[PDB]
């Protein structure tokens, strides 16, 4: 419809652009991804692993990615400035494992041969914001240890490690567990803390799964034992609480069908999270989201990038 | 819209004024609180903690309070007869700790200097129902132990302590937790019981969060080692069940939007609680509330206090 008219009739305001990260707000970059182009990226459900991906669909500044060789039911949407995709050849050049297309073996796969065989184009390098050409985030090296909140069970703070570093971000892994609970973040993430934070703050520390003598867990001896060093305390940066207020309006991807982006409202707030409500729909669809999540955007984002906006119901 | 005409078309009745605590029913007191006045009060999210607060808005007999130095997102609403607010200087005079405005440390804070610097007025003493002038709740002293229901997880009766006493009320604290589960009450609360009650009643007692050997928890040993005594059994003076009956109508603060007060009905009853239904709204917004809660009121309270009432629908 139009935002201008909607804000008059609702007597409301939009969340100002300044409240968002530059990456959530930027509309002036062209989407250079094209149908059929090949690339590499993380599997969202297994964020430690990399796969060969094909551009299946483009919609404004977003794209839908397909896992080569696998079912179309695993297809997923990202923004064109996603740091979780990389150009062909990136795995080899940066020390990452490639999970190759269904039916191949890790070391049977060659990009050269694959491209000859498919007659496909690799998405050009200059499309990617993340190619490991930038010096890492300060003080977070692979193997280093920290304390991390299980985002799936937020009443737990757990023994964790850095297991991956790519440009300004790093992968938080929970020791002796699956990669299923892992997540990417930066040094200002409010979900991570230095070694010794639990004991100093009062809350208990969940030790690694199947660890000998769980209640008797000592950090300094775990470190010596695993030949690891703790991430240094000066590395953990303060991210201030966001400044979103209740009733501010914005645009948000619908989690029930991620092809769609809707008119939305801030229903509630925490220090680092906002509760999204889709205007005109039931509150039952309301969901909590991190303020720096890639799938929320300032009013106007859709119109300026060429993606349809679902009006309110 | 009137109450008389509504009761006619629904052939309904209002809960009589006599069912309510005097404090919930009183309409003839003026609200002397003014915009910008400063005061002290508990943080409702951390009820053991006291902060400098400013009057941000007034509406009838209710006011919205702002945490000096902090964001407006934390503002909250109380009644002008709230016992959870106190005049400037109260914390020093009564042995309470002040969490000072965002940039301060506790001991640098002085009211005289703050008033001089802000040019603000302290809310006058005469507005406050609770200034620690009244006689304390007989029997309940600071440091005494008892058994308390976890209102957030009501199947659990837990090891607890008295951590604060203010006039006829006291603060119940769950041993080894922070204060997020704590609550203020009086000797007639149905949520508290003497040391030994769980044992005599055949119910499971939850020991402190990380008591070394929980299965073998023993009150006589715990009391000895913490140098504490039990609140005397005689001090626990249960209130009788309330007499609100299903379908009775009243006014209640909207929990999702505390600025608003709505027409409401008793959907359901327990001995000490009532289930509130907002007339004309989904039953999914229905909620259980203590019968003595400050945010339910007899029909006519909004009109007599100068607060808008949201009619049904």
Curated annotation (Swiss-Prot), chains A, B:
What does the entry note on its domains? The MBT repeat 2 specifically recognizes and binds monomethylated and dimethylated proteins. In contrast, it does not bind trimethylated proteins. The MBT repeat 1 does not bind methylated peptides but inserts a proline ring in a Pro-Ser-Ser/Thr sequence context.
Residues annotated as site: Positioned at the entrance of MBT 2 and is required for recognition of monomethylated and dimethylated peptides: 153
Q: Which domain of life is it from?
A: Eukaryota
Which GO CC annotations does the UniProt entry carry?
Answer: chromatin; chromatin lock complex; condensed chromosome; nucleoplasm; nucleus
Share any extra remarks.
Answer: The L3MBTL1 locus is imprinted. Paternal inherited gene is expressed, while the maternal inherited gene is silenced.
The entry's note on the tissues where this protein occurs is: Widely expressed. Expression is reduced in colorectal cancer cell line SW480 and promyelocytic leukemia cell line HL-60.
Query: What would changing residue 153 to A do, according to UniProt?
Result: Abolishes binding to monomethylated and dimethylated peptides
- Where does the record place its MBT repeats? 1-101, 109-208, 217-312
Q: What is this protein called?
A: Lethal(3)malignant brain tumor-like protein 1
- Ranges where the record places region Interaction with monomethylated and dimethylated peptides: 174-181
GO molecular function: any one?
identical protein binding
Q: Which cysteines are joined by disulfide bonds?
A: none
Biological process (GO), any one? negative regulation of DNA-templated transcription
Function field = Polycomb group (PcG) protein that specifically recognizes and binds mono- and dimethyllysine residues on target proteins, thereby acting as a 'reader' of a network of post-translational modifications. PcG proteins maintain the transcriptionally repressive state of genes: acts as a chromatin compaction factor by recognizing and binding mono- and dimethylated histone H1b/H1-4 at 'Lys-26' (H1bK26me1 and H1bK26me2) and histone H4 at 'Lys-20' (H4K20me1 and H4K20me2), leading to condense chromatin and repress transcription.
Q: What is its subcellular localisation?
A: Nucleus
| Range covered out of full length | 274 to 586 of 840
Asked if the record carries the keyword Repressor, the reply is yes
Q: What is the effect of changing residue 153 to Q?
A: Strongly impairs binding to monomethylated and dimethylated peptides. Abolishes binding to p53/TP53 monomethylated at 'Lys-382'
Subunit-structure text:
Homodimer. Interacts with RB1/RB (when monomethylated at 'Lys-860'). Interacts with p53/TP53 (when monomethylated at 'Lys-382'). Interacts with CBX3, ETV6, KMT5A and VCP/p97.
Give the gene symbol. L3MBTL1
Q: What is the lineage of its organism?
A: Eukaryota, Metazoa, Chordata, Craniata, Vertebrata
- Organism expressing this protein natively: Homo sapiens (Human)
Which keywords describe this protein according to UniProt? Chromatin regulator, Metal-binding, Nucleus, Phosphoprotein, Repeat, Repressor, Transcription, Transcription regulation, Ubl conjugation, Zinc, Zinc-finger
Phenotype upon changing residue 150 to N:
Strongly impairs binding to monomethylated and dimethylated peptides. Abolishes binding to p53/TP53 monomethylated at 'Lys-382'
Site (Mediates recognition of monomethylated and dimethylated peptides) found at 150
Question: For this protein, what post-translational modification is recorded in UniProt?
Answer: Ubiquitinated in a VCP/p97-dependent way following DNA damage, leading to its removal from DNA damage sites, promoting accessibility of H4K20me2 mark for DNA repair protein TP53BP1, which is then recruited to DNA damage sites.
């Amino acid at each position: 419809w139009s935002w201008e008219s909607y804000l008059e009739e609702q007597k409301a305001i939009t969340a100002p652009v300044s409240l968002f990260q530059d990456s959530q707000a930027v509309t002036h970059n062209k989407n250079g991804f094209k149908l059929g182009m090949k690339l590499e990226g993380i599997d969202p459900q297994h964020p430690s692993m990399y796969f060969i991906l094909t551009v299946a669909e483009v919609c404004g500044y977003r794209l839908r990615l397909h896992f080569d060789g696998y079912s179309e039911c695993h297809d997923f949407w990202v923004n064109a400035n996603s740091p979780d995709i990389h150009p062909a050849g990136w795995f080899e050049k940066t020390g990452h494992k490639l999970q190759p297309p269904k039916g191949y073996k890790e070391e049977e796969f060659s990009w050269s041969q694959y491209l000859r065989s498919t007659r496909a184009q690799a998405a050009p390098k200059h499309l990617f914001v993340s190619q490991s050409h930038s010096p890492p985030p300060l003080g977070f090296q692979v193997g280093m240890k920290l304390e991390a909140v299980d985002r799936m069970n937020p009443s737990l703070v757990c023994v964790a490690s850095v297991t991956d570093v790519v440009d300004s971000r790093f992968l938080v892994h929970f020791d002796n567990w699956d990669d299923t609970y892992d997540y990417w973040c930066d040094p200002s993430s409010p979900y991570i803390h230095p070694v010794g934070w639990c004991q100093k703050q009062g809350k208990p520390l969940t030790p690694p799964q199947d660890y000998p003598d769980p209640d008797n867990f000592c950090w300094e001896k775990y470190l010596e034992e695993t030949g690891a060093s703790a991430v240094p305390t000066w590395a953990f940066k303060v991210r201030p609480p966001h400044s979103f207020l209740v009733n501010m309006k914005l645009e948000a991807v619908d989690r029930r069908n991620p092809a769609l982006i809707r008119v939305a409202s801030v229903e509630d707030v925490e220090d680092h999270r906002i509760k999204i409500h889709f205007d005109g729909w039931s509150h039952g669809y309301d969901f909590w989201i991190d303020a720096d999540h890639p799938d929320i955007h300032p009013a106007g984002w859709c119109s300026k990038t060429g993606h349809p906006l679902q009006p309110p119901l």
